[PDB]
Design a protein around this motif. Structure first.
Motif, PDB file in Angstrom:
ATOM      1  N   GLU A  91      27.825  18.523  74.980  1.00 46.76           N
ATOM      2  CA  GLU A  91      28.472  19.757  75.408  1.00 46.76           C
ATOM      3  C   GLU A  91      29.322  20.388  74.308  1.00 46.76           C
ATOM      4  O   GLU A  91      29.463  21.616  74.277  1.00 46.76           O
ATOM      5  N   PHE A  92      29.855  19.591  73.382  1.00 48.73           N
ATOM      6  CA  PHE A  92      30.677  20.143  72.312  1.00 48.73           C
ATOM      7  C   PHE A  92      29.857  20.689  71.148  1.00 48.73           C
ATOM      8  O   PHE A  92      30.441  21.144  70.159  1.00 48.73           O
ATOM      9  N   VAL A  93      28.527  20.654  71.238  1.00 45.88           N
ATOM     10  CA  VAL A  93      27.689  21.194  70.176  1.00 45.88           C
ATOM     11  C   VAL A  93      27.648  22.711  70.285  1.00 45.88           C
ATOM     12  O   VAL A  93      27.317  23.268  71.340  1.00 45.88           O
ATOM     13  N   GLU A  94      27.994  23.386  69.194  1.00 49.04           N
ATOM     14  CA  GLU A  94      27.998  24.836  69.112  1.00 49.04           C
ATOM     15  C   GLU A  94      27.301  25.276  67.835  1.00 49.04           C
ATOM     16  O   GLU A  94      27.200  24.497  66.883  1.00 49.04           O
ATOM     17  N   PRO A  95      26.792  26.508  67.792  1.00 44.48           N
ATOM     18  CA  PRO A  95      26.382  27.078  66.505  1.00 44.48           C
ATOM     19  C   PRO A  95      27.594  27.299  65.614  1.00 44.48           C
ATOM     20  O   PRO A  95      28.721  27.442  66.092  1.00 44.48           O
ATOM     21  N   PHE A  96      27.356  27.307  64.306  1.00 44.55           N
ATOM     22  CA  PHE A  96      28.449  27.471  63.359  1.00 44.55           C
ATOM     23  C   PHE A  96      28.981  28.897  63.377  1.00 44.55           C
ATOM     24  O   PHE A  96      28.213  29.862  63.441  1.00 44.55           O
ATOM     25  N   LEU A  97      30.315  29.003  63.355  1.00 40.54           N
ATOM     26  CA  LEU A  97      31.058  30.250  63.136  1.00 40.54           C
ATOM     27  C   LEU A  97      30.791  31.288  64.223  1.00 40.54           C
ATOM     28  O   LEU A  97      30.769  32.488  63.949  1.00 40.54           O
ATOM     29  N   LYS A  98      30.602  30.842  65.468  1.00 35.64           N
ATOM     30  CA  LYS A  98      30.294  31.774  66.551  1.00 35.64           C
ATOM     31  C   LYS A  98      31.499  32.605  66.971  1.00 35.64           C
ATOM     32  O   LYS A  98      31.322  33.643  67.617  1.00 35.64           O
ATOM     33  N   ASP A  99      32.715  32.180  66.624  1.00 31.20           N
ATOM     34  CA  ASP A  99      33.895  32.979  66.929  1.00 31.20           C
ATOM     35  C   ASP A  99      34.028  34.174  65.997  1.00 31.20           C
ATOM     36  O   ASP A  99      34.539  35.222  66.408  1.00 31.20           O
ATOM     37  N   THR A 100      33.582  34.039  64.753  1.00 26.12           N
ATOM     38  CA  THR A 100      33.663  35.140  63.809  1.00 26.12           C
ATOM     39  C   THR A 100      32.586  36.179  64.118  1.00 26.12           C
ATOM     40  O   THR A 100      31.468  35.819  64.499  1.00 26.12           O
ATOM     41  N   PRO A 101      32.891  37.466  63.972  1.00 25.66           N
ATOM     42  CA  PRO A 101      31.870  38.493  64.196  1.00 25.66           C
ATOM     43  C   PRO A 101      30.862  38.539  63.058  1.00 25.66           C
ATOM     44  O   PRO A 101      31.035  37.921  62.006  1.00 25.66           O
ATOM     45  N   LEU A 102      29.785  39.290  63.290  1.00 26.13           N
ATOM     46  CA  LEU A 102      28.715  39.373  62.301  1.00 26.13           C
ATOM     47  C   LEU A 102      29.114  40.250  61.121  1.00 26.13           C
ATOM     48  O   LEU A 102      28.800  39.929  59.970  1.00 26.13           O
ATOM     49  N   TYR A 103      29.816  41.349  61.382  1.00 27.18           N
ATOM     50  CA  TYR A 103      30.204  42.284  60.337  1.00 27.18           C
ATOM     51  C   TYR A 103      31.605  42.803  60.629  1.00 27.18           C
ATOM     52  O   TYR A 103      32.002  42.972  61.783  1.00 27.18           O
ATOM     53  N   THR A 104      32.351  43.065  59.560  1.00 23.43           N
ATOM     54  CA  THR A 104      33.678  43.656  59.647  1.00 23.43           C
ATOM     55  C   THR A 104      33.670  44.992  58.914  1.00 23.43           C
ATOM     56  O   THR A 104      32.621  45.490  58.498  1.00 23.43           O
TER      57      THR A 104
ATOM     58  N   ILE D 220      22.429  18.433  59.097  1.00 24.76           N
ATOM     59  CA  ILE D 220      23.773  18.985  58.942  1.00 24.76           C
ATOM     60  C   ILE D 220      24.485  19.064  60.292  1.00 24.76           C
ATOM     61  O   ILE D 220      25.674  18.734  60.399  1.00 24.76           O
ATOM     62  N   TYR D 221      23.763  19.464  61.347  1.00 26.41           N
ATOM     63  CA  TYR D 221      24.339  19.418  62.698  1.00 26.41           C
ATOM     64  C   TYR D 221      24.677  17.987  63.119  1.00 26.41           C
ATOM     65  O   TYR D 221      25.719  17.741  63.739  1.00 26.41           O
ATOM     66  N   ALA D 222      23.806  17.035  62.786  1.00 26.67           N
ATOM     67  CA  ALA D 222      24.033  15.648  63.178  1.00 26.67           C
ATOM     68  C   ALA D 222      25.173  15.022  62.383  1.00 26.67           C
ATOM     69  O   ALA D 222      25.822  14.078  62.846  1.00 26.67           O
ATOM     70  N   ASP D 223      25.426  15.528  61.177  1.00 27.96           N
ATOM     71  CA  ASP D 223      26.562  15.052  60.399  1.00 27.96           C
ATOM     72  C   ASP D 223      27.855  15.750  60.790  1.00 27.96           C
ATOM     73  O   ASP D 223      28.935  15.188  60.583  1.00 27.96           O
ATOM     74  N   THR D 224      27.774  16.954  61.351  1.00 28.26           N
ATOM     75  CA  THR D 224      28.975  17.662  61.772  1.00 28.26           C
ATOM     76  C   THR D 224      29.460  17.206  63.144  1.00 28.26           C
ATOM     77  O   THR D 224      30.624  16.824  63.297  1.00 28.26           O
ATOM     78  N   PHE D 225      28.582  17.233  64.147  1.00 29.77           N
ATOM     79  CA  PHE D 225      28.991  16.890  65.503  1.00 29.77           C
ATOM     80  C   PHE D 225      28.710  15.441  65.872  1.00 29.77           C
ATOM     81  O   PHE D 225      29.554  14.805  66.513  1.00 29.77           O
ATOM     82  N   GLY D 226      27.556  14.903  65.484  1.00 26.18           N
ATOM     83  CA  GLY D 226      27.228  13.527  65.794  1.00 26.18           C
ATOM     84  C   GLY D 226      26.435  13.366  67.074  1.00 26.18           C
ATOM     85  O   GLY D 226      26.413  14.277  67.908  1.00 26.18           O
ATOM     86  N   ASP D 227      25.775  12.208  67.209  1.00 28.01           N
ATOM     87  CA  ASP D 227      25.001  11.808  68.393  1.00 28.01           C
ATOM     88  C   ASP D 227      23.877  12.792  68.716  1.00 28.01           C
ATOM     89  O   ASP D 227      23.619  13.089  69.885  1.00 28.01           O
ATOM     90  N   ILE D 228      23.203  13.309  67.692  1.00 27.40           N
ATOM     91  CA  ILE D 228      22.097  14.245  67.866  1.00 27.40           C
ATOM     92  C   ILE D 228      20.873  13.704  67.143  1.00 27.40           C
ATOM     93  O   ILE D 228      20.928  13.402  65.943  1.00 27.40           O
ATOM     94  N   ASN D 229      19.765  13.577  67.868  1.00 31.17           N
ATOM     95  CA  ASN D 229      18.474  13.249  67.269  1.00 31.17           C
ATOM     96  C   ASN D 229      18.020  14.482  66.500  1.00 31.17           C
ATOM     97  O   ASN D 229      17.489  15.430  67.084  1.00 31.17           O
ATOM     98  N   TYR D 230      18.229  14.471  65.182  1.00 35.63           N
ATOM     99  CA  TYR D 230      17.969  15.670  64.392  1.00 35.63           C
ATOM    100  C   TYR D 230      16.478  15.901  64.186  1.00 35.63           C
ATOM    101  O   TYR D 230      16.044  17.052  64.059  1.00 35.63           O
ATOM    102  N   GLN D 231      15.678  14.835  64.167  1.00 37.91           N
ATOM    103  CA  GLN D 231      14.236  14.990  64.026  1.00 37.91           C
ATOM    104  C   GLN D 231      13.586  15.571  65.275  1.00 37.91           C
ATOM    105  O   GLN D 231      12.534  16.207  65.169  1.00 37.91           O
ATOM    106  N   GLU D 232      14.184  15.365  66.447  1.00 39.38           N
ATOM    107  CA  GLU D 232      13.743  16.031  67.665  1.00 39.38           C
ATOM    108  C   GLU D 232      14.344  17.422  67.796  1.00 39.38           C
ATOM    109  O   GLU D 232      13.690  18.331  68.325  1.00 39.38           O
ATOM    110  N   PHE D 233      15.565  17.607  67.293  1.00 45.90           N
ATOM    111  CA  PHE D 233      16.213  18.914  67.332  1.00 45.90           C
ATOM    112  C   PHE D 233      15.520  19.904  66.403  1.00 45.90           C
ATOM    113  O   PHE D 233      15.509  21.111  66.672  1.00 45.90           O
TER     114      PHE D 233
END
Ligand SMILES: Nc1nc2c(ncn2[C@@H]2O[C@H](COP(=O)(O)OP(=O)(O)OP(=O)(O)O)[C@@H](O)[C@H]2O)c(=O)[nH]1
Ligand SMILES: [Mg+2]
Lengths: 154, 47, 56, 846, 82
Positions: A91-104, D220-233
């Motif tokens: 659940e704590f997995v997010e895309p990187f830098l999603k709080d920052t906007p795309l362009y300023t 990189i996601y698996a090294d940042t957050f952890g507990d992720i099968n990166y080869q399946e992701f």
């Protein structure tokens, strides 16, 4: 510039030479060793740089990343697995830098300063004494404009 | 195959009788680039 | 001529006296047969004169 | 010896060569200026701490020549040997060959693909697929190598075009679809589908050190957050698949109307935001972005300019280039596994022989077999070093070796020599590491064998290995047509130039130097910049003298159009035996089917004849009676029998044809018009009176006789000339295209295709031009279009010159460009005058 | 992850010889290895406790029963051990 009488041989026979298109001086200058006899002190010029396709922004109210229609439209139309083998992220997995906007507001200006001439593409440097800054150098360095008189070209 | 303060017209170059080089076909650069110093409205008229 | 004086690299072209006051379409064209014939002519004339008497 | 500081020990590289599974032989290629040498610079910076790029200039670590620095283009293919880690952390040994991307140096790629197993094709994300990319896909499929594609210059999708994210995804998908189309056009293998889900397509930006596959960024996601099968992701980050934030799943249907694709949402938009926060917002919101991503910088590092700071941020973020290693290991075979199609393709004598089965396992001991393709010069230029790969055995310094040339056969044993190996190196770009032994599977630099080597060589053992045959010569992708003539200024210095003329014949693979019958020294080339580099290297490195060069001309060929009006008969001077022939032209498209090896001799008379009687609708009496083709290697000229068995005994005819084929093969070269080769003709023997006594069947009677028969049949059937046509692709802005149409109007050319580039404001113009008109063409375009339009030209085909080359009624005024009917006569007369024949040839000459 | 597991992944592709808790010695080319010591190996010479030598061409060893492994000697110049 000021300069820094050949006989008829077997080699310069004009009956052997096919005259189809006239050979000019820029052919000798671009390729200094193919068309030149005695090429003593020539210098090898640069060949080619890839085409910088930077397109200028005219409207500040448009977004900084926009499909400017000078760009040609892309014509439209893989091992995709099934949805049943359910992969689930924590659940704590997010895309990187999603709080920052795309362009300023400073995005398009920051991209436009990347292709600015010297020193406007810089952000730090040293001072120069005021008589060592020519302001006319690009103007006679680029080319002659069309329609100018004779003495201006000279 | 075989004193004078002005500059004379015999010192001129680019006197070449070529259809490619007299009309050198200058660029306008996507209708966005402008030649510096020459008036911008006049450049928009001569495009 | 080429029996006693061979020319493997066609070196008799360099050193040929030619009239520079005329243009190139006017002066002598240095074809290889003509240069060899001129060398042969001058050698055949030079063989007839003893060098202790006179010299060309 | 002294060596620069390297992140790995050199004894590790010495011990890693002994395992043939942990090696990859990889050739990097692509179009002109799409980022090859800069990616090699990034790899060198990864492997060397003390080698860094200047802040204002490109490094070009593998560009060591002075011409390569002054011109700014790649000239010679250069090797490098590095050790790289993968994603999981295992060290691998890579032998990377940087080939030049210009079209005229395509011969430098063919010498690079002979000693490698995998191809890495760099493609510009802005320009897309171009001419040399389309040629190298064909040349990599036809040489049977595995192909991977890396998309370079994606920052031009960010900082130059300023393109929306899903449109840039559409651009990348269109590029990959065009690659899949060009693969499916030439390949017969249906398992060559390229897709980033398979780890087969990698994305990169060479200027700012960006390189990632799906698996590395998932790591990189698996090294940042952890507990992720990166080869399946990584299996679900391409295509029409969507992240649903409610159920946290990857579904193919739309959750909302504004839901982006997963590749846009997880990968591409964080890249946009990193570049945006570095470039536009360096002063206000950059420390928050760098504190969120986990990257710390020094205050002295924060005062740099925009481009080195962006390169530093992307280098600290993405780190090591593991995705390229993963791709080049997964989709390129090891030299132990991939040895068998290499031996099947390149070794003469087949893989089914005894030595082919020994080379098929990459045995590091046993019969020493090496294949050297490249010749490098020293700093002094007085001697050369051979460069190749070790197919089998282990090569040693000081060992006596046997050099075998391209003219060696087991019957002749003439082109062979015994030499002594001086030193052995492994090659890095700007330095060489000296070793004393090289096992099988590696690349090797050999000193002391350069004297019998002309183009390629095969290194064997002196004692034993008696059934060793040579490997195939390099089959180039094009044919050199540009003739230039050279002379020395001082005629006394002629043996000096004849030294350098055989030295530049060694370093240049597709160069052809010859001496005419009139005494002219003729060099063949493919273009202007190619012969420019020839002249530079020749003079400045091998002559140190002044050399006069003539006007360049193209190579002409001979043909027929009509059927001859009268049967052409000729006897030998022994006056016992007579040969009669009718000459006809071939059908449209058969010549290319010969040239591209579709139709083949050596076949046992069944499939050969069935091809003729199936496709081109030949009769059974015509398909079963074909005998030979061309001079030498199968030229598109054809020997045909039409002698009926009721009049000519075929059991006596079958003894003389071994001399007839020599007659044809020696008569189909240097034809009667201007001593050139024939195109698109068949040679139909109608009547033959064969001598009965064996002494009257000598070859010395009949081979010049059959030569004269060929010549008479050629002269009677309306002979014509043929000239080469180039294919031209022009990259120009939206208004300069009309200027291109204006320039091509005067060089007897025609424009075939005008196509807009999708995703770019540039156009492409695809046209044909005569090669005799293509002198100064590039300079004309780059002068008339202000340097904006750029053009490249390759050899494409041959077509018939308009005009009659035998019309003596046509008078030719010298020093004038003649119109279209005068062309063939002018060309034929001037080539006869240049080569040194008579001023005319008659119909009744032979 | 620790240091010996990176050395174990470094020794893949080479000929290692492993002894497990049942006293059996397996010598052959290491194909695959993981974070745990699950080792897939091929072309295996098998030594039992009594002394019988067998030839088993594909072996997959669980990491729990392993006493130890024996690695090639040229890994002292490997980068993670320097
Ligand atoms: N924008 C951008 N430019 C790049 C990138 N990679 C290379 N270039 C530039 O493109 C130009 C040519 O790069 P090279 O690497 O010299 O091109 P090349 O592929 O070696 O050309 P060849 O000599 O044919 O091999 C240089 O100015 C590079 O800085 C990239 O990722 N982005
Ligand atoms: Mg390059």
């Amino acid at each position: 510039f000021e300069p820094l009488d050949e006989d008829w041989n077997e080699f310069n026979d004009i009956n052997k030479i096919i005259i189809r298109q006239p050979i000019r001086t820029e052919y000798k200058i671009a390729f200094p060793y193919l068309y030149n006899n005695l090429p003593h002190h020539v210098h090898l010029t640069w060949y080619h740089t890839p085409n910088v396709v930077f397109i200028k922004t005219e409207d500040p109210d448009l977004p900084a990343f926009y499909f400017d229609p000078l760009i040609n439209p892309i014509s439209h139309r893989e091992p995709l697995p099934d949805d049943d083998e359910e992969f689930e992220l924590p659940e704590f997995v997010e895309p990187f830098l999603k709080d920052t906007p795309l362009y300023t507001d400073n995005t398009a200006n920051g991209i436009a300063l990347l292709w600015a001439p010297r020193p406007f593409n810089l952000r730090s440097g040293r001072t120069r004494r005021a008589l060592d800054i020519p302001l006319v150098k690009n103007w006679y360095r680029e080319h002659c404009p069309a329609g100018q008189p004779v003495k201006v070209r000279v | 195959y075989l004193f004078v303060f002005e500059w004379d017209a015999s010192e001129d170059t680019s006197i070449d009788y070529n259809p490619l080089y007299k009309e050198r076909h200058q660029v306008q650069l996507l209708g966005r680039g402008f030649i510096a110093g020459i008036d911008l409205k006049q450049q928009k008229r001569e495009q | 001529y080429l029996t006693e004086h061979p020319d493997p690299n066609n070196e008799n072209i360099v050193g040929y006296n030619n009239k520079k006051c005329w243009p190139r379409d006017a002066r002598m064209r240095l074809m290889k047969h003509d240069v060899n014939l001129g060398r042969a002519v001058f050698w055949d004339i030079k063989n007839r004169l003893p060098r202790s008497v006179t010299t060309v | 010896q002294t060596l620069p500081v390297t992140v790995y020990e050199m004894d590790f590289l010495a011990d890693l060569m002994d395992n043939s599974e942990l090696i990859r032989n990889v050739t990097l290629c692509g179009h002109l200026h799409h980022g090859k040498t800069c990616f090699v610079d990034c790899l060198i910076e990864q492997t060397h701490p003390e080698i860094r790029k200047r802040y204002d200039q490109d490094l070009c670590y593998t560009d060591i020549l002075f011409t390569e620095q002054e011109r700014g283009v790649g000239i010679k293919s250069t090797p490098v040997t590095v050790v790289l880690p993968d994603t999981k952390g295992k060290s691998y040994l890579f032998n990377i060959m940087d080939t030049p991307g210009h079209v005229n140096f395509s011969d430098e790629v063919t010498a690079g693909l002979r000693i490698s197993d995998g191809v890495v094709l760099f493609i510009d994300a802005a320009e897309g697929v171009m001419l040399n990319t389309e040629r190298l896909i064909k040349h990599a499929v036809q040489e049977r190598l595995a192909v991977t594609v890396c998309i370079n210059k994606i920052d031009r999708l960010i900082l130059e075009l300023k393109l929306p994210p899903t449109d840039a995804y559409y651009k990348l998908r269109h590029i990959v679809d065009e690659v899949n189309g060009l693969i499916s056009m030439y390949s017969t293998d249906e398992n060559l589908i390229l897709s980033p889900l398979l780890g087969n397509v990698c994305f990169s930006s060479s200027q700012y050190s960006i390189c990632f596959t799906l698996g590395s960024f998932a790591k990189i996601y698996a090294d940042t957050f952890g507990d992720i099968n990166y080869q399946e992701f990584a299996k679900r980050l391409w295509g029409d698949i969507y992240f649903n934030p409610k159920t946290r799943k990857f579904t193919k249907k739309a959750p909302t109307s504004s839901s982006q694709r997963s590749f846009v949402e997880f990968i591409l938009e964080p890249l946009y935001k990193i570049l945006a926060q570095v470039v536009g917002d360096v002063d206000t919101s950059l420390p928050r972005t760098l504190d969120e991503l986990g990257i710390h910088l020094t205050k002295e590092e924060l005062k740099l300019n925009i481009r080195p700071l962006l390169r530093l941020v992307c280098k600290k973020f993405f780190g090591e280039f593991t995705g390229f290693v993963d791709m080049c290991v997964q989709h390129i075979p090891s030299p132990k596994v991939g040895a068998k199609p290499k031996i099947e393709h390149t070794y003469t004598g087949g893989v089914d022989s005894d030595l082919g089965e020994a080379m098929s396992d990459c045995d590091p001991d046993g019969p020493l077999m090496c294949h050297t393709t490249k010749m490098y010069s020293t700093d002094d230029g007085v001697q050369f070093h051979a460069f190749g790969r070790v197919l089998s055995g282990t090569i040693h310094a000081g060992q006596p070796v046997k050099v075998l040339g391209e003219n060696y056969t087991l019957e002749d044993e003439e082109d062979s020599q015994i030499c002594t190996v001086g030193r052995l190196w492994i090659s890095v770009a700007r330095y060489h590491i000296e070793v004393n032994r090289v096992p099988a599977g590696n690349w090797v630099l050999i000193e002391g064998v350069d004297q019998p080597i002309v183009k390629t060589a095969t290194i064997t053992e002196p004692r034993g290995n008696e059934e060793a045959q040579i490997f195939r010569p390099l089959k180039f992708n094009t044919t050199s047509v540009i003739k230039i003539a050279v002379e020395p200024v001082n005629p006394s210095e002629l043996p000096k130039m004849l030294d350098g003329l055989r030295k530049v014949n060694k370093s240049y693979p597709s160069l052809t130097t010859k001496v005419e019958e009139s005494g002219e020294h003729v060099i063949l080339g493919t273009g202007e910049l190619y012969l420019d580099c020839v002249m530079h290297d020749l003079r400045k490195m091998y002559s140190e003298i002044d050399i006069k060069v003539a006007d360049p001309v193209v190579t002409f060929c001979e043909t027929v159009v009509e059927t001859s009006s009268l049967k052409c008969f000729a006897e030998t001077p022994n006056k016992k035996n007579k040969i009669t022939m009718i000459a006809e032209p071939l059908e449209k498209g058969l010549a290319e089917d010969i040239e591209n090896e579709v139709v083949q001799i050596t076949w046992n008379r069944k499939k050969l004849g069935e091809f003729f009687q199936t496709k081109y609708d030949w009769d059974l009496l015509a398909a079963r009676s074909i005998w030979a083709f061309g001079p030498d290697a199968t030229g598109p000229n054809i020997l045909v029998d039409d002698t009926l068995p009721s009049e000519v005994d075929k059991a006596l005819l079958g003894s003389v044809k071994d001399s007839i084929v020599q007659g044809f093969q020696w008569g189909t070269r240097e034809g009667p018009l201007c001593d050139e080769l024939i195109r698109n003709v068949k040679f139909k023997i109608l009547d033959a009176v064969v001598a009965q006594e064996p002494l009257h069947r000598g070859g010395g009677q009949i081979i010049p006789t059959a030569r004269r028969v060929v010549y008479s049949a050629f002269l009677m059937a309306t002979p014509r000339l043929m000239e080469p046509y180039y294919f031209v692709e022009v990259q120009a802005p939206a208004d300069c295209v009309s200027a291109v149409y204006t320039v091509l109007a005067r060089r007897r050319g025609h424009v075939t295709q005008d196509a807009p580039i999708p995703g770019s404001p540039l156009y492409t113009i695809k046209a044909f031009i005569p090669a005799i008109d293509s002198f100064g063409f590039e300079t004309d375009l780059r002068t008339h279009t202000q340097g904006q339009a750029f053009s490249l030209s390759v050899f494409h085909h041959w077509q018939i010159v308009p005009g009659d080359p035998l019309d003596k009624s046509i008078v030719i005024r010298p020093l004038e460009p003649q119109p279209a009917p005068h062309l063939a006569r002018e060309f034929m007369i001037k080539t006869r005058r240049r080569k040194g024949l008579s001023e005319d040839v008659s119909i009744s000459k032979f | 992850i620790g240091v010996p597991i990176k050395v174990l992944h470094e020794a893949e592709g080479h000929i290692v010889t492993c002894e497990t808790n049942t006293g059996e010695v397996y010598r052959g080319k290491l194909i695959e290895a993981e974070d745990n010591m699950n080792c897939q190996m091929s072309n295996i010479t098998v030594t039992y406790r009594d002394g019988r030598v067998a030839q088993l061409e594909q072996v997959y060893i669980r990491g729990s029963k392993i006493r130890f492994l024996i690695l090639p000697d040229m890994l002292k110049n490997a980068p993670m051990l320097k």
